[PDB]
Design a protein around this ligand. Structure first.
Ligand code: CA
Ligand code: CA
Ligand code: CA
Ligand code: CA
Ligand code: CA
Ligand code: CA
Ligand code: CA
Ligand code: CA
Lengths: 141, 57, 145
């Protein structure tokens, strides 16, 4: 779709995180890995269903133009959504533990130190946690 | 039979309408399933980007 | 609750889909009717449409389920919009008049076996201004009677 270059670079960034072997095609295996890393439990048939829905050319994998059409098509309830993925407390704060859990689930095997370090740089008021404003701030927007 | 002729007209129109309803029923399913799957994949992509921001800082 | 006459009319339409007369419309029967009408759903799509209408999940659409489908409200459905849509089907060339030949095609597409003379008498029955054609007002009068 017709978005800004910054938007396109962002979606390429997301795409590259799905496409772990870098061949330019997201497979059901690759989609399954991402989803499961984020706490979801899709079946193989459900993964094929998801790929099929996005796979506009029928080759059984998702390329970048197909992924872009997906991401391209109210506009700030998804920032809370992202925060929600981290705040498993629904207590309004991402803890060191909660961030650690997500970040490690995503393959970034961080030591408790690196985690605490990450928390320390994001934490603007110093309460030991990351609230909604500190989160959006790290996102940039 | 006047009554039989008029009933034949109505029956034809009803069958056409029925076919249209069967089809619309499918279009609704399809649009809902499509939105569902898309919002699902999008929410995961946004989660990944959120994570990546923490790495980028 | 619909008129006992409405019910009778829905039974006629139902019986057209249910060609083997067992009281159940299958994906095959639905496919046959739609194809003759110029549609071409895949088997998967036929199954999906049966599925959405098959309330008790037994695999086929019975008369109560069909009735429920025909009684629902829809959204694009300004009752007049359904009439206009039906008219556009009959009036194939979109010139605003259903001709005898156009009604012949609809009846053939419905698998009905009417002679040409029977179709003429259908036109005569609905034709109020005697031009041998059915316009929208005439069509509506026949439908909304
Ligand atoms: Ca790949
Ligand atoms: Ca593809
Ligand atoms: Ca929390
Ligand atoms: Ca804080
Ligand atoms: Ca049957
Ligand atoms: Ca049934
Ligand atoms: Ca015409
Ligand atoms: Ca006339």
């Amino acid at each position: 779709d017709q978005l800004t270059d910054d938007q396109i670079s962002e979606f390429k960034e997301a795409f590259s995180l799905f496409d772990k072997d870098g061949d330019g095609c997201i497979t059901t295996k690759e989609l399954g890995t991402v989803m499961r890393s984020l706490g979801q439990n899709p079946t193989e048939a459900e993964l094929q269903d998801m790929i099929n829905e996005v796979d506009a050319d029928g080759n059984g994998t998702i390329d970048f133009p197909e992924f872009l059409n997906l991401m391209a098509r109210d506009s700030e309830e998804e920032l809370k959504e992202a925060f929600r993925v981290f705040d498993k407390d629904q207590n309004g704060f991402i803890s060191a533990a909660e961030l650690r859990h997500v970040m490690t689930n995503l393959g970034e095997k961080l030591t408790d130190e690196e985690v605490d370090e990450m928390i320390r740089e994001a934490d603007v008021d110093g309460d030991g946690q990351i609230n909604y404003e500190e989160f959006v701030k790290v996102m940039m927007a | 039979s006047s009554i039989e002729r008029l009933q034949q007209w109505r029956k034809a129109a009803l069958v056409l309408n029925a076919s249209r309803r069967f089809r619309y029923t499918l279009d609704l399913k399809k649009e809902q399933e499509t939105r569902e799957m898309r919002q699902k994949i999008r929410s995961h992509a946004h989660a990944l980007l959120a994570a990546n921001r923490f790495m980028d800082m």
